[PDB]
């Protein structure tokens, strides 16, 4: 399957303290591998994955240096955004950015990514052509123009298509043993009464990696959509994930329902029922 690198950066302004809090987090195949917190005693990117330990002092100084540069960018942008929206001071605001690149199983580029959010809403995002932008709203229009005029896109497309891909190649080669492993799902079904003549069946999937997975319930061959609740995939705490799908069934006719678990670590889909 495909691969990717991502940097999730957040800056939160705050009343009084003229310096916003800044947190940047990088990921590889959705695994946190480095991290920077401006509030730490000694700000600097820190290896968050074991395969990042082999990176020497020059590597971390360059990374930490960029983070310091980012803080200022975010500090300034937050300030400008506060003006674009005529908001008052003495408050707290959030500005976020997501950057990265997707690679196919062949380790070649699929997509370049770069977008921002303010107050938790899309602000401006670099289009897939890596040449134009999409301004989610009026204020962002001001920003789209500034950037179209400055030609910022060319700089990001350069990073996204070059340095992003190159460095992602390496991290994949270094964290080979860990990043490219797959842990198949372990399934079981639970039973709980719901209402009169009603029953709730829950298809569980535990200890799997990667987090992407598909859980379905079906009645004799047809797939079920109504009265079917899919909870959010959650971390177990040991690097594997869990998820479950529930469906309301008429009391008595339970063996007629079956669920399947799909995951890339599985030769063939798991199939199970509620066995009393």
């Amino acid at each position: 399957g495909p691969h990717s690198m991502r940097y999730f950066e957040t800056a939160v302004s705050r009343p009084g303290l003229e310096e916003p809090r800044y947190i940047s987090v990088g990921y590889v195949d959705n695994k946190e591998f480095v991290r920077f917190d401006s509030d730490a005693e000694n700000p600097r990117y820190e290896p968050r994955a074991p395969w990042m330990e082999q990176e020497g002092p020059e590597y971390w100084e360059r990374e930490t240096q960029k983070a310091k540069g980012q803080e200022q960018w975010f500090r300034v942008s937050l300030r400008n955004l506060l003006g674009y929206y005529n908001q008052s001071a003495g408050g707290s605001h959030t500005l976020q950015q997501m950057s990265g690149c997707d690679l196919g199983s062949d380790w070649r580029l699929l997509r370049g990514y770069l977008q921002f959010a303010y107050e938790g809403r899309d602000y401006i995002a670099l289009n897939e052509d890596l040449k134009t932008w999409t301004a989610a709203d009026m204020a962002a229009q001001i920003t789209r123009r500034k950037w179209e005029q400055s030609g910022a896109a060319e700089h990001y497309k350069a990073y996204l298509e070059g340095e992003c891909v190159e460095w992602l190649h390496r991290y994949l080669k270094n964290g080979n043993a860990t990043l490219l492993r797959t842990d198949s799902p372990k399934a079981h079904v639970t039973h709980h009464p719901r209402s009169k003549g009603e029953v709730t069946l829950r298809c569980w999937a535990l200890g799997f990696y990667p987090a992407d997975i598909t859980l379905t319930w079906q009645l004799n061959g047809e797939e079920l959509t109504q009265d079917m609740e899919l909870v959010e995939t959650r971390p177990a705490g040991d690097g594997t994930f869990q998820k479950w799908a529930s469906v309301v069934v008429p009391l008595g006719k339970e063996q007629n329902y079956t669920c399947r678990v799909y995951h890339e670590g599985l030769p063939e889909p798991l199939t199970l029922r509620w066995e009393p």
Binding site: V34, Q70, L81, Y84, I124, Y159, L160, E163, C164
Partner: peptide, 9 residues
Amino acid sequence: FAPSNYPAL
């Protein structure tokens, strides 16, 4: 390898 931003919003 992180990116570095150019023109402020």
